[PDB]
Ligand binder design. Structure first.
Ligand SMILES: Nc1nc2c(ncn2[C@@H]2O[C@H](COP(=O)(O)OP(=O)(O)CP(=O)(O)O)[C@@H](O)[C@H]2O)c(=O)[nH]1
Ligand SMILES: Nc1nc2c(ncn2[C@@H]2O[C@H](COP(=O)(O)OP(=O)(O)CP(=O)(O)O)[C@@H](O)[C@H]2O)c(=O)[nH]1
Ligand SMILES: [Mg+2]
Ligand code: NA
Ligand code: NA
Ligand code: NA
Ligand code: NA
Ligand code: NA
Ligand code: NA
Ligand code: NA
Ligand code: NA
Ligand code: NA
Length: 403
């Protein structure tokens, strides 16, 4: 039989709106995600006596290649399925903090390169998600020749960049054509990365829930649940933890943040319970928190650490930055203006998104006064910088948060 384990690697799925990311995740895992930032898992295996790529399977059967033998289990994987709409760029960025590698979906029946094909690509590059596969989707509605013309364009686009040798795999997500080749590619190009389990446990929070059905009395009201991904170390049932920056507190119209202390009462990945949670996959951490504290993704953008961890929670930050030449996600070409004092920027840090006012500009460094504080769990954390342009938040640069 195949073991029941947590996913060991997160594969982002990104690309322009409606290019078919969610359908692709469904073709691979059998699961349709409904959430804004979607999540789905599957086991991956290989029928060792069969020919590749058909030998790759997502279920323990080799019947499709004529064997009654069980396929060799390789690993469980999971997908972080980002939204494509330009208005949802921040969500993509938050999801990108959880990715170990990625698939960039390009619709074969739309002119390449579309605005969020570019914006998501560049974001992946900046964030360091470079174990990339480019998937040419919807090849079912175009001829081989049209798809090949676009392939040439994609090679031209990636040439001279970090992605110059990234593979391009043509599929139909909708009608499930050539999916096996994509599985083979995932195994070849998106290896599970090394995890130093000795590092202090840190989890980035992207969801939080009240899991109680209506008509539940207090006597059995379950404690709040917090969802996200472990980016380093590992957590275990009964650990004393804290959520940072924590809870927004109002004292006569004055607003501050207080760390939320709690205890891990349960750990789930998908439909399975575990005693510990490691990087890879999206974990649900059960706590003893009042469910009102976690309801409706209240804690999105928080981090979780062990209760005694030392973590700066900052209302002001210094960033060693670099700007892009052009606003890549804009429809009409546009140069990136230099950062100016007093302007409001949007900062993506881990899973968090925060507005701040620029209080100092230098050539390599800016200082920013944050509208709400950010937990900075390490010394070399990358931030992605967006500017509001014609009413839309567009990525214009990035930086390292300086401690
Ligand atoms: N012909 C064809 N249509 C496809 C294929 N994959 C997806 N589609 C269609 O494209 C549309 C968008 O699919 P969807 O999976 O929601 O794309 P998405 O990128 O996740 C949408 P969003 O960017 O908002 O997350 C759907 O109508 C879907 O049926 C394909 O391989 N071939
Ligand atoms: N660790 C742990 N996780 C739980 C527990 N109960 C539910 N979860 C997790 O919390 C999440 C929310 O589950 P639930 O609210 O029951 O289903 P849902 O309504 O589809 C979630 P949403 O409200 O976002 O649509 C799920 O990922 C589930 O695995 C629990 O007792 N312990
Ligand atoms: Mg989608
Ligand atoms: Na599966
Ligand atoms: Na197969
Ligand atoms: Na990563
Ligand atoms: Na190029
Ligand atoms: Na170029
Ligand atoms: Na360029
Ligand atoms: Na990481
Ligand atoms: Na602190
Ligand atoms: Na301050």
């Amino acid at each position: 039989a195949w073991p029941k384990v947590q996913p060991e690697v997160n594969i982002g799925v990104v690309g322009h709106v409606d290019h078919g990311k969610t359908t692709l995740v469904q073709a691979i895992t059998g699961i349709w995600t409904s959430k804004k930032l979607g999540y789905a898992e599957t086991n991956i295996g290989v029928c060792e006596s069969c020919k590749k790529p058909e030998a790759y399977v997502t279920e323990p059967s080799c019947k499709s290649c004529g064997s009654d033998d069980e396929p060799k289990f390789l690993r469980r994987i999971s997908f972080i399925d980002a939204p494509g709409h330009e208005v949802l760029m921040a969500t993509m960025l938050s999801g990108a903090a959880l990715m170990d590698g990625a698939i960039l979906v390009v619709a074969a029946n739309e002119p390449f390169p579309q605005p969020q094909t570019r914006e998501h690509f560049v974001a992946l590059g900046i964030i360091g998600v470079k174990n990339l596969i480019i998937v040419q989707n919807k090849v079912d509605v175009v001829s081989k020749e049209e798809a090949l013309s676009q392939y040439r364009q994609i090679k031209q686009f990636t040439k001279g960049t970090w992605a110059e040798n990234v593979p391009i795999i043509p599929v139909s997500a909708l009608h499930k054509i050539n999916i096996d080749s994509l599985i083979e590619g995932i195994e070849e190009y998106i290896k599970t990365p090394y995890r130093d389990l000795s590092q202090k446990p840190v989890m980035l929070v992207i969801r939080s829930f009240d899991v109680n059905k209506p008509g539940t009395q207090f006597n059995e009201l379950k404690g709040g649940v917090i969802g996200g991904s472990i980016i380093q170390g590992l957590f275990k049932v009964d650990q004393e933890i804290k959520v940072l920056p924590g809870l927004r507190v109002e004292k006569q119209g004055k607003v501050s943040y207080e760390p939320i202390f709690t205890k891990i009462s349960s750990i789930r990945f998908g439909d399975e319970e575990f005693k510990e949670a490691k990087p890879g996959g999206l974990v649900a951490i059960g706590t003893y928190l009042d469910p009102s504290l976690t309801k409706a993704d209240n804690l999105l953008g928080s981090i979780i650490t062990l209760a005694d961890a030392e973590v700066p929670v900052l209302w002001n930050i210094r960033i060693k930055y670099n700007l892009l030449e052009r606003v890549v996600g804009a429809k009409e070409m546009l140069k990136v203006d230099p950062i100016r004092a007093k302007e409001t920027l949007m900062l993506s840090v881990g899973s968090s998104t925060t507005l701040g006012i620029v209080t100092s500009v230098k050539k390599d460094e800016i200082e920013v006064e944050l509208r709400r504080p950010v937990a900075v769990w390490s010394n070399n954390i990358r931030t992605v910088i967006s500017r509001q342009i014609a009413g839309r938040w567009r990525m214009i640069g990035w930086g390292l948060v300086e401690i």
